[PDB]
């Protein structure tokens, strides 16, 4: 169940990528965090990953659609 606290927990993960705090994670933010994760995805890889979550087709992920992806995987306890 999406509790109030969980919404805040998701925010912590969002701000981890959104460095400047614009509210939208671009390929630059993603690439920076990905490198610290021990990986090195190319431009094409980064953009493709964005398109996976972006159901609008704007080339950027915001908090609302970010929640949708998280909830979609959290609603599965199997």
């Amino acid at each position: 169940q999406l509790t109030e606290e969980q919404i805040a927990e998701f925010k912590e993960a969002f701000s981890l990528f959104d460095k400047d705090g614009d509210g939208t994670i671009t390929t630059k933010e993603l690439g920076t965090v990905m490198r610290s994760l021990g990986q090195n995805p190319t431009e094409a890889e980064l953009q493709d990953m964005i398109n996976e979550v972006d159901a609008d087709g704007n080339g950027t992920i915001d908090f609302p659609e970010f929640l949708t992806m998280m909830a979609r995987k959290m609603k599965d306890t199997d």
Partner: peptide
């Protein structure tokens, strides 16, 4: 900080 690591995996 563990939770953040888990949430990061869900982002992959």
């Amino acid at each position: 900080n563990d939770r953040l690591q888990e949430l990061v995996k869900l982002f992959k």
